[PDB]
Amino acid sequence: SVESSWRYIDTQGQIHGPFTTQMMSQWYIGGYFASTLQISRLGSTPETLGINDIFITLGELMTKLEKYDTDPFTTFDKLHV
């Protein structure tokens, strides 16, 4: 059973990560992420949404999933990995 690794770009353009789905989830639920935050799922395994290794806003990740439970990261791994 696979857990994803994620990166994100801050407002100074620095790349942080890779951080696990669980970590990303916690920060999401913590309210730390803006919907404008550019994030990326690392292409460590195949996945059915089609977001491996691309940078998209958190808001766009959610438009693609069309439904989330507690957070888009956990949802992604559950539904697409």
Partner: peptide
Amino acid sequence: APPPGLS
């Protein structure tokens, strides 16, 4: 506790 680079 906050993610690095975001505040």
